[PDB]
Subunit: 310 residues, 5 copies
């Protein structure tokens, strides 16, 4: 087998698209490995750039292709560099730019923690003939800085894994498992946008929809609460704006459903109160006396969700 040493440089991470579960990675790929010695002009290694590497491959150079597994489309390679040493180590450099896609789990969406994964494999050389020795990661341009809505934490977590591909069994019986390089880039979201943008105006709308309880006329109790109920229902599709069509709820989702329950229970309580007014002049007191206990109850449900879910 042949040892391979890979060094990775990450330029910038951008274009994180939760709707399509994609994100874009910029950087360079450097693969170092050792072969037979050769002769170079001078005692200095040879520089072979693009539209000249193919000529040396046609001469008989062995340059394996190292693909990326978790990409959509094709890695948009730029220039590519081949470095040839007389002593017998061959170094291939290229600038990738890939649109990477991976699984994400949005349970606690405003305060979520994700990771970016990079999965690299040789295309046709198994570890019995091409082994990845080690990788050292270079993340310094994005080491501690904020992506447009995500914060970065710490260094990269890396691992090389060996995975079996059963679909080569008819064409390569026993040696069909591949050395795979896996790199993790941890990332945490900034809650700040949603905190100043949605949970605040919703908070004011909930407060006004509670303050409607202090009124003393029936039309003011119903019509304003109805308009507020419909406009609160109109904010159901905020999660679908940023995220996909997720089968599970978030804090915005759970909060807005709790708001729905509050306003619907309020309008049912008012209707039941008027139905208890048999003559239209007998006044109930206990049924609107909930101005101070149930706000503590709603904050209690909120703090139970906060304590248990965190």
């Amino acid at each position: 087998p042949v040892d391979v040493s890979v060094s990775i440089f990450i330029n910038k991470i951008y274009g994180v698209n939760t709707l399509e579960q994609t994100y874009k990675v910029d950087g360079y790929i450097v693969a170092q490995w050792t072969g037979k010695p050769r002769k170079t002009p001078g005692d200095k290694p040879l520089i072979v750039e693009n539209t000249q590497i193919e000529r040396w491959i046609n001469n008989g150079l062995w340059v394996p292709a190292l693909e990326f597994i978790n990409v959509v489309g094709s890695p948009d390679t730029g220039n590519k560099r081949l470095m040839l040493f007389p002593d017998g180590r061959v170094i291939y450099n290229a600038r990738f730019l890939g649109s990477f896609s991976n699984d994400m789990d949005f349970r606690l969406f405003p305060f979520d923690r994700q990771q970016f994964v990079l999965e690299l494999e040789p295309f046709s050389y198994n570890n019995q003939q091409l082994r990845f020795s080690d990788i050292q990661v270079y993340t310094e341009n994005i080491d501690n800085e904020e992506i447009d809505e995500w914060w970065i934490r710490g260094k990269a977590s890396t691992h090389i894994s060996d995975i079996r591909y059963d679909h080569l069994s008819s064409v390569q019986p026993n040696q069909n498992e591949f050395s795979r390089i896996t790199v993790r880039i941890d990332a945490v979201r900034n809650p700040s946008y949603y905190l100043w943008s949605f949970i605040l105006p919703l908070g004011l709308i909930i407060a006004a929809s509670w303050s409607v309880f202090w009124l003393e006329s029936f039309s003011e109790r119903l019509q304003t609460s109805f308009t507020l109920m419909l406009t609160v229902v109109a904010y159901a599709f905020y999660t679908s704006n940023i995220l996909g069509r997720l089968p599970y709820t978030t804090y915005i989702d759970q909060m807005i459903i709790a708001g729905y329950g509050s306003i619907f229970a309020a309008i049912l309580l008012i209707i039941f109160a008027h139905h208890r007014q048999a003559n239209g002049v007998e006044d109930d007191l206990l049924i609107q006396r909930s101005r101070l206990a149930f706000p503590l109850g709603f904050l209690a449900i909120g703090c139970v969700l906060v304590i248990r879910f965190f």
Copy 2:
């Protein structure tokens, strides 16, 4: 004729676009077939990667092109591998990534069951000179896991079909039918998103638009019901958001039209009730007595649609 053995690996299915009737498939193609024996260096098969397969084709190697029928655009191939055995079997490997399009039928949209089809054909070699022997499918990375709004069930269903192309009749009279590989990937949707997102707030709006019947003043009976009627009409275009401009209705569509009928019959009943008030003080009882029977009627229409349609 020449036998061909194809083994298929499916990496991931994503980007299911019901609006354009497209979906994206990642994976690898492996075609195995047997020809004349040859000479290789060593007793080990030769590895010929990209920008070197064309040289061996120019040497006289017979590598047929196996296209995909049901794609939009072109399959975005990546690297391609040619495996050459001295004993006389030639194995071609390539990584496809295609945007696949096929028919879909959205009668029962929230609870629908679809399948993904892959249709492959050689470009110019009929089965009298190129026969597909068999295919074995490899679906393990996506064997039992949820696509972003679709669930996967079971293994792949495969079939090889032989179809006649009449447009080669002027250029190839009798032998113009092609061996086609067909692979089915069954998929079932998750109703969960729409269940928590749309049928619930619509349910609360219908319940409030019914609870308006318990009021005792004319302006409250009309104005709130009118605003609720217009906002219920405003949710007509929800199906057009996810789906296309379909000629047929769904459960959201049938439910929202039933809601339209309920609110329009309610407002007509209220107007007819006031017209029966000849003096403006004579009160009707039978015309608003439908508070308990017609909700059972609406649930009856719903359960009839549920029982008969399922």
Copy 3:
């Protein structure tokens, strides 16, 4: 001159974009023509696939380029096949996929009938040296089936036309007119989507905006009619959603303007009625007596438009 026989296969029509006046066509191109005889291995015609046709062109083969006139961008060709017969007929096959654009006329939009046109020309060979003999069309996969909002009727209508290009006059004086292949694919829209989706809720809104005439209080006559008037105005941009910024009106457009006239005349009639109430207690009868005659009038305007326009 040289005869050319072209046979066309159409795979599927999709992606009809009325906003950009584009549509996508899938299929294969087959051009058959006769030249000088040659020598082949065996008595069987030679199969020359892609990345090998260029070598035979460099050998001295005459393969003309047959472009498409009415495309946007470039035809996304796939594989291409060259068929070489010893007796002297050369057959070129390729899989096109083009985004085709042509004129459309949307006078009667919900019930419109269009056609898809395919315009093909050789790039540089006039009919004095390259003549199109005939074409036979192959439309069987889409022969009788519904495109996502269009129905297909009958077979293809074809014609070969000879058109003069005056811009070669400085470079080719007398022989500058080109043989052009024209294929028509008739298509009719399905009215069903718009029939269940827009003309129905608009019908209910118009009916409610008429039923407001049966009320007996001024505020109920004005405020509800005003809200309904503004929401009917809000549906002006439905045509701009599907279609472009058309200089002419459709049935949705004419219907919604008729609705505008109805609601604006109604609110002016109510204001004029209240102005005729000099003391605020004198009641008019003739000015609201139009509950039964003018609905017949509005249906009369509708049926006049239906009878005359159809």
Copy 4:
């Protein structure tokens, strides 16, 4: 210097995008020029198509590259034709398709007049070694017909200009000015869409918001005028839909701001009128007597803008 004769054919203009200031042009490029005589087979000029022009360039043919200046991206060339005459004139043909971008000035947007400009330059040959003799334009397929929202007027206006490029001064001291071909295609918009689509419903809304002055109750004067004021404010973003984020106003913009002034002055006048009602029963007459003079005033402001601006 070398004379060059260019003849231009324009196929169709489409995809005019005011938001990105782009438009798409289809057509062919024909460049005719005279060089040294040569030998051809027969007495007939040689036809050299694509993937064969490069071989003759490698033979020593001088084919300059004629780029387009005002494009975004790259001109999507199709086939390219080289015509070789024995007498010594070389004719290059190619089918371009470019996305062209240029300045536009939207002062009087609904009734605007623009022009399409085509700017062509050789890439590296100045007029001391490559001179453009003349151009004759061929616009017949689009000579008098309507683009989807633009009308075409007259023939093309052309000019060849010689412009200095100062950035070659370090590499070519004295001879660094380039012969540039400039073609103008005048175009005028059709006001019809906006005339039937926006200025009409806005006209009805303004008329209703004036007709609110004829009412006799305070709540009807305020609430309806408030809802109409907010929905008129809601139509502020119509210009941003079609156009960009322009620093200057249009007729829709000026009209909607005039509407804003009318409704805001009306609501301030009503509030001031009620404040002049000291006892709540004393009635003002002069403050609502403006039903007939200020509509003439608003039409006067409109006709002043029409007369002065046109």
Copy 5:
């Protein structure tokens, strides 16, 4: 080391996308450097255009690749020119078109000042073998003119920087720092669009929501203020339209939150006023006496933000 002189021409800047933090740059690249002398036909330098530069590279010409660091995707190069002098200076010309991305800081968004940065580096040649001598910038076509929402100020600010790349340490121990060309293009936004488009209608809405204080009936004080409050809340997402999901607020954001505070404090003050009405007939004076002091207070908060923030 080898000196390199680079001259840059900028054609046009367009497509500034704050949502994706991208912008597009058009222009040409010219690199001048001196090598060994050679022989040319005549005493005039040789013109080598595209699809001929690669042949001279294969002959043994040393043409380094000068990439751009801060691009997304790949620079869409057009034609490329090589200029060869007999005396020994080699000049490479090419037309780039890149989508450039860089950091932006939107604290004071309507009145912001940004700069466009261009970062260029050789791909594999460090300054010990390739040194950038100097750069002279050519910005004349866009020297003083307005980009579609940005104004340009002054000349370009340029600097050449030398940056260490630690990821070549395993492959090149001591000499791994690269000469980088950095060009700054200062740009200032035009506040005019937002000034006439959003801060004006919001100003009228705030003025009407203040003028509601002059009314004398409870329903008019509540219902209109409630509808205005909800529609003011509805304009929260204006910043998200142009900008991204920013963690920090702007002047539109701070102004709209101040409006939220004004309307919510107003509705709470009205509710508290009615609660102070113990009998429903006792009238408060001090609680609505804030018609003249708190508008001065709101303008005071605005002018404090204006003075301190500027």
